[PDB]
Amino acid sequence: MTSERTFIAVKPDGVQRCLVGEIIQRFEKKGYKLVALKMLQPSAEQAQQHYIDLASKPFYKDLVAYFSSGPIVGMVWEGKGVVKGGRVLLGATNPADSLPGTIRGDFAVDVGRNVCHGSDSVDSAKREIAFWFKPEELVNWTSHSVKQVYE
Amino acid sequence: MTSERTFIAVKPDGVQRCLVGEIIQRFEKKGYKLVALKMLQPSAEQAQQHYIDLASKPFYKDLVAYFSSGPIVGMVWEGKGVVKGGRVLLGATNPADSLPGTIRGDFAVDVGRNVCHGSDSVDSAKREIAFWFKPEELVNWTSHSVKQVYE
Amino acid sequence: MTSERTFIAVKPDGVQRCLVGEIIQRFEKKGYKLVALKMLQPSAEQAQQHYIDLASKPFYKDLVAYFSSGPIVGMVWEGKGVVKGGRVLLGATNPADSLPGTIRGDFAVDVGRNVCHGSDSVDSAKREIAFWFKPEELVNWTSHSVKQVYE
Amino acid sequence: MTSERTFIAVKPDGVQRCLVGEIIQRFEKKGYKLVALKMLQPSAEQAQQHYIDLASKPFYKDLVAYFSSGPIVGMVWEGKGVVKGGRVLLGATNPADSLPGTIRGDFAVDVGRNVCHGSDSVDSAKREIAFWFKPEELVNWTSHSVKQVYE
Amino acid sequence: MTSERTFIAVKPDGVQRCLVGEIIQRFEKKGYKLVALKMLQPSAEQAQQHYIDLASKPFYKDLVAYFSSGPIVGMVWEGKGVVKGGRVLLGATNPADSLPGTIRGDFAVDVGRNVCHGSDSVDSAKREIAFWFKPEELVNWTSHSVKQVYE
Amino acid sequence: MTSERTFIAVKPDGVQRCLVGEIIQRFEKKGYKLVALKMLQPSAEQAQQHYIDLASKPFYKDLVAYFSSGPIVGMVWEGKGVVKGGRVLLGATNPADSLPGTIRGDFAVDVGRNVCHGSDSVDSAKREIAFWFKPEELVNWTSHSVKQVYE
């Protein structure tokens, strides 16, 4: 019933290189609806609870310090199976395994600077929604293409 | 030598989402000679003969009903392996399986709303050109860049 | 006045340099509904009545020949200020006078090869629509975002 | 001069016309830096307070109605001549007078649904951001091509 | 007049800002023929002589120093009025004065970093060709689409 | 490593199909810095040493004639995995098997007219850098964005 949302956010290196628009159009062109959208410097504490599962790895400190290094576009988006679909639309986390046509395969090159963050699962979707977003900031509304998008 | 000719009809949603230019641009910069075109409101009776292969299937009334909900560009392209090759350009029928870089993967989401159609084979194509288009609607010409596309 | 129509034609050189897609996209992305679309080589006979206003001009001999030399993407576009806005989108008659952002301004060099026509008036438009297309060829529907193009 | 700021908002017709990325893109591709960006349904008193200058207006109640009939994108952008120049990007108030290559010239037919609003002067700009944005939301950062934007 | 050439040089900031191809595509799509190209670092005795009209100006040193600070892509561009057309495609000397769709209006913001140079006269081009390019690096060929661009 | 340089040569069909701009702008958005870029109608004698290993093959001759039927744009792109990833940017040598979103995938149809050329190894890149270029043509500077594409 088209119920999934997925958190989508452009990392500093993409935003720093004028990619906020393209990534935004890419989802709009897929047939995805926006729910909430901002531009925040994620604080050291936030990125850490965000990357809580990556807390024990050696590359971890460099990841959040990079992730905190500048203001990020946080977003929610709406589609069916959006989490897997955004994940396909993003490509593989290492922009080397991702084919061109996917975003990271198109704009990034190295895994440390991979343009964006998209939720790995449903469990990840909701947690990343509760974390970056207040409940009221997710606006409910109808896209005008809806019936020509969904059956 | 005369080439394979596909039959590519852009669906009611495709025109309605305003990618006729985006779509025509693809078979174009690829190297294909469009040999026949018109924009029509496809008759239910006309549609029925198109999906005559399934006239026993249940969604059949909804398909004919939806395929008549908006206008169609009824197209004919030329090129070596244009039927399979256009299907290569299009992606798989279901857009979630469609690789970005394609028409279906780059622009839409849903299968009942997969933006455009193409004959699955020459045999299907050859029936599909003769049905939607009059023989004189098929423009016979040589492009000024035939020699640079073809050896 | 959303109901107003015009007539664009990509001329022989227009297809032959492979710019059909770029042209069609710009009219699409602006927010007009394509109503009728085809591809034809005009018989010198058809080119004549289109130019019957200049059948007595000095360049009528060349103008017919230039128009008959290639196939043509015959088009009917719909919506508010589609006549005036469309011609402006094409730019000046001479592409030497055509501005950046224009089809002739971005892609062409000579008035002898100005790549494209756009209805100079409603009078010419409606005559040009009736002249190229049957009514059973104009496909009347509604854009999913028309309510967002239109009040 | 370089730290001059301006207010631009896409109205309801824009967001519901899937133009959000395209409007952002012509500024970012222009090379103006994003300062603050949020998606909001502006309230009755708010919509009135922005047009408090138009309080004695017969099209006021309907303007309040439209500006509130859909979601809005309230944006901030920084750079030299960002106030004057941004207006040139949007085009003039009438979309029929907005020139090919401007936002309004490329994406709209009528003044009443003109997709985008721009600060008209420096004084107005600070008034339009100070009313619409909180102080902490206005982001301080530096684009990697600042030295390649500016002397 | 179809045989005219012009010198277009993408400036150090042009090289640095990821735009070399987009620049080439802009002449290429317009209808212009690449005559010659190289990627060099222009010497001080090169730039001073290139600009000997500006060798005595109060900004002469820092001018040569900037234009010497990064590599430049020297181009030679052929066609009917390629000099007069090319400057127009590029935009005005002042990118604050440069309009949408020009090289300077779309990418740059301030004159001291105006991304691109265009021959201002036939005399200046042939000086700008002979001083910048060797006799043999100037390619004589006919484009396969010349007949579709000219009469 | 980070410093690796690859060779790219754009085909005669490439200049002629109006694509050199699309080719370079693609490598630029990637994170790659242009180290060398030149243009020439190449001698048959050249096409000999680049294609020396095949000199006894029956398909050598038409090959030399084609790579000599038009001009060529020779490039040297810098970046991590420029040879390896860059090929994925081109697609498979046969544009027919090449996935759309790639270069030969987005524009070419038949392998005999395959638009561009990328190095196949570390070994060939260094020979091809030796062949198309004098050492003085290679330019040494820093892209203002390096610290953001890289760690």
Is E14 strand, coil or helix? helix
Nearest CB neighbour to B101, from listed A30, A32, A101: A101
d(CA C14, CA C11): 5
**In this structure, what are the phi and psi dihedrals at residue E133, rounded to the nearest 5 degrees?**
-125, 140
Residue F2, token pair as written in the block: 């980070």
Answer whether D67's CB lies under 8 Å from D78's CB: no
Q: Nearest residue on chain B to A102, judged by CA atoms?
A: B100
**HSE-up (13 A, CA, CB side) for residue E56:** 1
Q: Do D148 and E100 touch (CB under 8 A)?
A: no
In angstroms, what CA-CA distances link F130 with A29, A80, E38? 44, 53, 16
- d(CA B36, nearest CA chain C) in Å: 6
* Chain A residues within 8 A of D39 when measuring between CB atoms: 34, 36-37, 139
Q: Which residues of E33-67 are buried (b: 16+ CB within 10 A; e: fewer)?
A: bbbbbbbbbbeeebbbebeeeeeeeeeeeebbebb
Distance spanning both ends of chain E, measured CA to CA: 13
Answer whether B151's CB lies under 8 Å from F110's CB: yes
* Chain C residues within 8 A of B140 when measuring between CB atoms: 41
* Chain D residues within 8 A of A69 when measuring between CB atoms: none
* Chain C residues within 8 A of E80 when measuring between CB atoms: 109-110
Q: Do F30 and A96 touch (CB under 8 A)?
A: no
Sign of CA dihedral C111, C117, C122, C127: positive
Q: How many CB atoms lie within 10 A of CB A66?
A: 17
D69 touches chain C (CB under 8 A): no
Candidates D5, D33, D50, D117; catalytic one: D117
**In this structure, what are the phi and psi dihedrals at residue B62, rounded to the nearest 5 degrees?**
-65, -40
Please say if E50 is a catalytic residue. no
Contacts with F98 (C-beta within 8 Å, 6 or more apart), sequence order: F90, F91, F92, F104, F105, F108
Q: Do F21 and E22 touch (CB under 8 A)?
A: yes
H/E/C letters for each residue in C65-107?
HHHHCCCEEEEEEECCCHHHHHHHHHCCCCCCCCCCCCHHHHH
Q: Do F25 and E22 touch (CB under 8 A)?
A: yes
- d(CA D142, nearest CA chain F) in Å: 12
Sign of CA dihedral A96, A102, A103, A107: positive
F18 touches chain C (CB under 8 A): yes
CA neighbor of A78 nearest in space, from A120, A19, A23, A138: A138
Q: Nearest residue on chain A to D29, judged by CA atoms?
A: A18
Residue with tokens 């190095």: F119
Nearest CB neighbour to E139, from listed F71, F143, F144: F71
Is F75 strand, coil or helix? strand
DSSP assignment letter at D52: G
CA neighbor of F33 nearest in space, from F129, F135, F134, F141: F141
CA neighbor of F147 nearest in space, from F2, F1, F6: F2
DSSP assignment letter at A137: G
Dihedral (Cα; B96, B99, B100, B106), 10-degree rounding: -50
In angstroms, what CA-CA distances link E15 with E7, E11, E24, E104, F7? 16, 6, 12, 14, 18
DSSP assignment letter at C55: T
CA neighbor of E37 nearest in space, from E46, E45, E29, E27: E27
D62 touches chain C (CB under 8 A): no
Answer whether A47's CB lies under 8 Å from A67's CB: yes
Residue E110, token pair as written in the block: 């301030």
Is D53 strand, coil or helix? helix
**HSE-up (13 A, CA, CB side) for residue F34:** 34
At CB < 8 A and 24+ separation, what contacts does E26-29 make?
E26/E89, E26/E103, E26/F21, E27/E75, E27/E77, E27/E86, E27/E89, E27/F21, E28/F15, E28/F18, E28/F19, E28/F20, E28/F21, E29/C106, E29/C107, E29/F18, E29/F21
d(CA C89, CA C11): 16
Dihedral (Cα; D122, D124, D125, D128), 10-degree rounding: 170
Write the burial class of residue A130 (CB in 10 Å: 0-12 exposed, 13-18 middle, 19+ buried). exposed
Helix (H) or strand (E) holding C123: helix C122-132
> Residues 70-99, chain C: which have Cβ within 8 Å of E?
96, 99
Query: Order of strands, edge to edge, in the sheet holding B116-118?
Result: B33-40, B72-78, B5-10, B116-118
Answer whether C53's CB lies under 8 Å from C13's CB: no
Binding residues of D: 11, 59, 87, 93, 104, 114
At CB < 8 A and 24+ separation, what contacts does B103-106 make?
B103/B19, B103/B23, B103/B26, B105/A101, B106/A29
Is B54 strand, coil or helix? helix
d(CA F59, CA F46): 17
Residue A114 assigned ligand-binding role: yes
Residue E40, token pair as written in the block: 């060099």
CA neighbor of C36 nearest in space, from C118, C141, C116: C141
The crossing angle, in degrees rounded to 10, of helices B82-90 and B20-30 is 130
Q: What distance lies between CA A3 and its chain's CA centroid?
A: 17
CA neighbor of F127 nearest in space, from F76, F85, F91, F84: F76
Residue B7 assigned ligand-binding role: no
Residue F23, token pair as written in the block: 């080719």
CA neighbor of B77 nearest in space, from B40, B17, B117: B117
In angstroms, what CA-CA distances link A97 with A121, D2, F150? 20, 41, 18
Angle at F10 between CA F5 and CA F11, to 5 degrees: 145
Helix (H) or strand (E) holding A23: helix A20-30
Candidates A5, A26, A33, A117; catalytic one: A117
d(CA D54, CA D49): 9
Strands F72-78 and F5-10, sheet pairing:
antiparallel
DSSP assignment letter at C131: H
d(CA E132, CA D110): 51
> Residues 132-151, chain C: which have Cβ within 8 Å of B?
136-144
Q: Nearest residue on chain B to A151, judged by CA atoms?
A: B112
Q: How many CB atoms lie within 10 A of CB B142?
A: 9
List chains adjacent to chain C, taking adjacency as at least 3 C-beta pairs closer than 8 Å.
A, B, D, E, F
Which residues are A100's β-sheet partners? A102
Candidates B5, B26, B50, B117; catalytic one: B117
Candidates E117, E128, E129, E132; catalytic one: E117
Answer whether B99's CB lies under 8 Å from B88's CB: no
* Chain E residues within 8 A of B147 when measuring between CB atoms: 144
* Chain C residues within 8 A of F17 when measuring between CB atoms: 18
**In this structure, what are the phi and psi dihedrals at residue A147, rounded to the nearest 5 degrees?**
-70, -25
Q: State which amino acid sits at residue E144.
A: H
In angstroms, what CA-CA distances link A40 with A53, A73, D35? 22, 7, 11
E110, E111, E114, best to mutate vs chain D, most D CBs in 10 Å: E110
- d(CA D79, nearest CA chain A) in Å: 15
Answer whether E132's CB lies under 8 Å from E7's CB: yes
Answer whether A72's CB lies under 8 Å from D34's CB: no
* Chain F residues within 8 A of E140 when measuring between CB atoms: 41
List chains adjacent to chain D, taking adjacency as at least 3 C-beta pairs closer than 8 Å.
A, C, E, F
CA neighbor of F33 nearest in space, from A51, E71, B151, A112: E71
Contacts with B136 (C-beta within 8 Å, 6 or more apart), sequence order: none
Residue B17 assigned ligand-binding role: no
- d(CA C11, nearest CA chain D) in Å: 21
Q: Do E137 and F20 touch (CB under 8 A)?
A: no
d(CA C13, CA C99): 20
Q: Nearest residue on chain B to C31, judged by CA atoms?
A: B18
- d(CA D104, nearest CA chain C) in Å: 9
At CB < 8 A and 24+ separation, what contacts does D53-59 make?
none
Distance spanning both ends of chain F, measured CA to CA: 13
Which residues are A8's β-sheet partners? A75, A118
Write the burial class of residue B119 (CB in 10 Å: 0-12 exposed, 13-18 middle, 19+ buried). buried
**In this structure, what are the phi and psi dihedrals at residue C10, rounded to the nearest 5 degrees?**
-80, 115
B13 touches chain A (CB under 8 A): yes
A112 touches chain F (CB under 8 A): yes
Dihedral (Cα; D93, D98, D102, D107), 10-degree rounding: 90
**HSE-up (13 A, CA, CB side) for residue E90:** 25
d(CA B20, CA B14): 7
Contacts with C6 (C-beta within 8 Å, 6 or more apart), sequence order: C76, C77, C82, C83, C86, C87, C118, C119, C125
Write the Ramachandran bin of B31: left for phi over 0, alpha for psi from -120 to 50, otherwise beta.
left
d(CA F17, CA E25): 11
CA neighbor of E7 nearest in space, from E69, E102, E90: E90
Residue C17 assigned ligand-binding role: no
Q: Do C147 and A144 touch (CB under 8 A)?
A: yes
d(CA A94, CA A121): 17
Strands F72-78 and E116-118, sheet pairing:
unpaired
d(CA C106, CA D42): 39
Answer whether F150's CB lies under 8 Å from A110's CB: yes
Q: Obtained via which technique?
A: X-ray
d(CA C89, CA D109): 13
Q: Which residues of B39-73 are buried (b: 16+ CB within 10 A; e: fewer)?
A: bbbbeeebbbebeeeeeeeeeeeebbebbbebbbb
**In this structure, what are the phi and psi dihedrals at residue E149, rounded to the nearest 5 degrees?**
-95, -35
Strands (E), D79-145: 116-118
d(CA E117, CA E97): 16
Residue with tokens 């059949």: B60
Q: Do D139 and A73 touch (CB under 8 A)?
A: no
- d(CA B17, nearest CA chain C) in Å: 7
d(CA B85, CA C90): 32
Q: State which amino acid sits at residue C26.
A: R
Q: State which amino acid sits at residue E19.
A: L
In angstroms, what CA-CA distances link C116 with C10, C15, E17? 4, 10, 34
Number of structural domains, chain E?
Answer: 1
Sign of CA dihedral B24, B27, B28, B30: positive
d(CA A100, CA F27): 12
Residue A18, token pair as written in the block: 């004028």
Q: Which residues of D116-147 are buried (b: 16+ CB within 10 A; e: fewer)?
A: bbbbeeeeebbebbeebbeeebebeeebbbee
d(CA A84, CA B110): 14
Q: What is the DSSP string of F11-60?
A: -HHHHHTT-HHHHHHHHHTTTPEEEEEEEE---HHHHHHHTGGGTTSTTH
B11 touches chain A (CB under 8 A): no
- d(CA E107, nearest CA chain D) in Å: 5
F29 touches chain D (CB under 8 A): no
Distance spanning both ends of chain B, measured CA to CA: 12
Sign of CA dihedral D122, D124, D126, D132: negative
Q: Do C13 and E148 touch (CB under 8 A)?
A: yes
Q: Do C91 and D112 touch (CB under 8 A)?
A: no
Residue with tokens 């993967």: B105
Q: What distance lies between CA D40 and its chain's CA centroid?
A: 13
* Chain E residues within 8 A of F19 when measuring between CB atoms: 25, 28
Residue E144, token pair as written in the block: 């396969």
List chains adjacent to chain F, taking adjacency as at least 3 C-beta pairs closer than 8 Å.
A, B, C, D, E
- d(CA D96, nearest CA chain E) in Å: 17
Q: State which amino acid sits at residue C89.
A: L
d(CA C33, CA C142): 8
Answer whether F20's CB lies under 8 Å from E25's CB: yes
* Domain hosting residue F151, numbered range: 1-151
In angstroms, what CA-CA distances link B145 with D2, D61, E65, F113? 49, 59, 46, 12
Helix (H) or strand (E) holding A74: strand A72-78
